[PDB]
Amino acid sequence: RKLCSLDNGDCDQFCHENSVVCSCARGYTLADNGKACIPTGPYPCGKQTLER
Amino acid sequence: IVGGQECKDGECPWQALLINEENEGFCGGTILSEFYILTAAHCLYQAKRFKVRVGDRNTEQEEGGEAVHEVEVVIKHNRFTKETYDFDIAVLRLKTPITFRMNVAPACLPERDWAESTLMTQKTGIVSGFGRTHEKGEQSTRLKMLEVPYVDRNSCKLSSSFIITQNMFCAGYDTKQEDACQGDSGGPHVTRFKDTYFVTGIVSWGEGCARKGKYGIYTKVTAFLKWIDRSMK
């Protein structure tokens, strides 16, 4: 029953709706839990550059 | 940028500057990847030949991260015109790839439907640039950023001596003296969602800077998401 209109369906990035599918931008991989987005490199899009 | 604040270290890494033959900044760009820069089509007429500089926060201070990249190709939106300023978008491909590092990194492109229901519906976006600090003022040697509220389309249309198409959106303040300004055009408008920044607009145009009753006008990137993809391949 989850919906994208409630805490973005618990997704870190993209949410899409008879149940919710999370997805991620290029340079990230969708976690095993189907929610989180993992950076596949040190300079992933949209991340400010703070350590390193 | 009128008002706002100096971009702190590492906080506007997708910022690019387009530089004159005399090595003066005249427009911004948004880094999209190692080979591509998003900018505004109308920025293309204001200089015959130019390059793009990244990793710079202080044009008067060589930090050690600067890198100047020449343009291999220019892909202007074939429907852009000076008459309308509509479709004010363009992609640049760089001869040499960017090396991402401190202060140099790309902003994310969103999925369109989600960006419409989730990004464009936030309260605010962030715009950044080395542009003037007041209308009749002069460019700032330091990279500034400014949080600008989304402005509803009807208010946008009413406030404007010019036609606002569906490829355009308003951001900023009615009376508050904060806004993008001359020299920021082409530069980023990005929207944060859970600590990730997504490209939402391209600085396009304004009637002055920070004028009362007037807002900043931006290219609506959700309308050019498939176009940017094809432009990049």
Ligand SMILES: O=C(CN1CC[C@@H](NC(=O)c2ccc(Cl)s2)C1)Nc1ccc(-n2ccccc2=O)cc1F
């Ligand atoms: O040419 C200027 C000069 N301005 C003087 C200060 C600069 N200000 C800005 O670029 C911005 C202010 C807020 C943002 Cl965002 S960009 C631009 N402004 C305009 C006004 C109107 C227009 N037009 C809009 C629609 C159709 C045809 C047009 O010619 C373009 C401009 F560049």
Ligand SMILES: [Ca+2]
């Ligand atoms: Ca510098």
Ligand code: NA
């Ligand atoms: Na205003």
